[PDB]
Every structure is written in C-alpha cells, then in structure tokens.
Design a protein around this ligand. Sequence first.
Ligand SMILES: [Cl-]
Ligand SMILES: [Cl-]
Lengths: 192, 192
Amino acid sequence: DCRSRLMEVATELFAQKGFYGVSIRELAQAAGASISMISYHFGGKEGLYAAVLQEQFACFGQLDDIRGQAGDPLAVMTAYLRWTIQRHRNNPQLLRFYTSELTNPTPCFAAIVSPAIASVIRLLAESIEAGMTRGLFRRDLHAVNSALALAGMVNYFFLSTLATEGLTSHSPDQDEELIRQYVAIFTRGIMA
Amino acid sequence: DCRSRLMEVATELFAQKGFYGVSIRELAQAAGASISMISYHFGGKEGLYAAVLQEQFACFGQLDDIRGQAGDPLAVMTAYLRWTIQRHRNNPQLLRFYTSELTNPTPCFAAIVSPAIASVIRLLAESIEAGMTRGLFRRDLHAVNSALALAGMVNYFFLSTLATEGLTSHSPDQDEELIRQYVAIFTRGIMA
Ligand SMILES: [Cl-]
Ligand SMILES: [Cl-]
C-alpha cells in the first residue's frame, strides 16, 4: 500500500514542481516513507518519476480508436479529437507533465514523451497524406505541419483554459460541439 | 550591475525549475549576491520572479503591428502569426514561463499572464467577428473558439519542437512558409 501512496504523492509533487523542482526528501516526507524505502525499493526520485510519466502517457500506446478509422481521413481526425478531449478530461495532470517535458526535458523525454507524441503526429499525417493522394485534401500543404495544426488546436484549447475562463465555455457539455467546430475549421477553414 | 546579473540568473533558474522549484538561497548562490541584497533591495524571490515574468510578457502590451491591420481580418491574422513567430524566435524562454503559468499558476498568473493572453485572443476574436458580419467568414463558428484555434496552431508548432525534430523543419528559413500554410488552413481548411 505504500507503493500506491508513493505514486499519488509523486504524481502531485512532480506535477506541481516538475522533476527538477522535487527532492527525494520532499517525496519521503509527503508519503511518510523513509528515504531508504524510496531509494532501495521504489527506484529513487528517478524511478518514481519514470513510473509517473509512464502512467501519464500510457494511453498513447493504445491508439486503436483512431487507427481503426483508417480509410476515412475525416473519421480519423474526428476520432483523434474525441480521444484527445477524453484524455484531458480523464487526466487533468497531463498538460502539466506534457508541457514541462517539452520545455524542460528530462531523460524521460526521449524515452517516453517524444515517441508518444511522434506516434500520434505520424498517424494523423499518414491519414492526411492518403487524403491528399485521393484528391480529398489539397496538395500544396505539408501533411506533418497540418497534423501539428490539428493537434495544436485541441491541445491549446485545454492549455489556455485558465486565461480564457470568461471568454468561452470549457464545460464538458460543450466538448462534442468543440469537435464539430474544430473539424469544420481544419477541413473547411473559417471562410464563408 | 548586480541587478543585471540577478535578472539573468533569475530568468534561467525560474525558466528551468519554475517559481515553485526555485529557492532564494539558490538565486543568491548562482548570482553571488547575499540573501539580504535580494530580500531588501531586489524584492526577494517574489519580486525577482515578477520582474522576470513582466519582461517575458512585455511585448503583449505592444500589439500595434496587429491592431494596425484592423479593417482587413486576413491581414490581422497574418500579422498575428508573424508577430507570434517573432516572439518565439526572439525569446526561446517564453514557452517555458507561458506553459508553466497556465498549468501551475502563481499570483503573477492573474496579474500578468492572463490579461496578456486574453488581450490577444480578444483582438483576434474581434477581427473574426467583423469578418463574420461582413460575410467573409462563416456564421456558424464561434469567434473566440476560432481565435483559440489559430493561436493553438502556431503556439503548438513551437511547443512540440523537441518531439518533432525529424518530422518537419523548424528552421527560421521556413517561418514565412509556415505562415502561408497556417493562414491557408485557418481560412480555407485542408479540403481540396
Ligand atoms: Cl486514412
Ligand atoms: Cl478587422
């Protein structure tokens, strides 16, 4: 059971202060574990951080709701948006770790974060590439940059929440309408 | 001169570890200043952090390159992209502070970060609103959510750089082409 309480405490301290702001003394104190339990049995600060980040990014190795729509690029893009919104609703901590690693990487960035993000961007880009070949999508746009644009739309909506509280709804009630809006912008733009 | 060296040291330590990961002892040690100089003359950890964040967000109070294009929504959107890219090229530290505050806010979030971001989003939304009234833009999309989408495109391109190194160019040589691509997606979508 002190394994579970350590995972909780590690997630909340590393989420707050990042890997570079947390000490093993703080982890032990917050969990009521000894520095020795932590170092010898739970992999130290580093082992706990790796375990926490692996849990944060676990869902990125499970892309079948998106991959399963291949053959219909619009359905792929829609599934990607729905999946991404779900991820954020289920895990309020994720953008803390995701942005902290992208802007102040640890050794876990190359091991866990970078391949997770790249796998998703690739998947989207492949679908865009297929749509371009088919003539559904315009051939003067670059598939990866286009994928990054879609990913940016949805991820910035959640990232900017605290600064935009009175400017738009962030209620989960409106998530399906957000998907409708971002699918429309990405595929058809804002032009009349 | 120890004022200048303190600002440098504060920017680099707060950029790395965030406000919540930096101690006044670390600041003094890194700058070769006493804890007393810092507390009594430079406003302590908090004063230094406020000064650093104010410098990080200073350019957000200077939006005339964007505002000056009002009357032509496309020119506003283009100017916004160009300005945002410039900001990131001139200040590699900015997304560290920007994401850290949005995900782990300090008292400086409400004072500095939130109004800076809101002022830009408002400006974009107003231009989109005008274009909708004029019939240039579709009336079934929400202006603020659309503004957030454009902001998300460009900000995610820089945010995701470390994870996408081999997937697309991030060379400043290609910044004008990026603007061309993101203007095209936002206004016309990816459809043929
Ligand atoms: Cl496909
Ligand atoms: Cl306008």
